[PDB]
């Protein structure tokens, strides 16, 4: 899920845009 | 914005600030 993807690899405010949806 | 690994309270505020939007709405879908 999104907390262990974007703490072991980078998320870009444009991978966390697709996230809010 | 700037390239980093996050965690937490920054990853959701972080994922709220692009969005505009809080989510958690009357009766929670997520």
């Known amino acids: ?21 | 914005f700037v390239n980093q690994h996050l965690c937490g309270s920054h990853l959701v505020e972080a994922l709220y600030l692009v969005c505009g939007e809080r989510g958690x709405f009357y009766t929670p879908k997520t």
């Open chain 1, 1 to 21: 899920g999104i907390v262990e993807q974007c703490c072991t690899s980078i998320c870009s405010l444009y991978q966390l845009e697709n996230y809010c949806n």
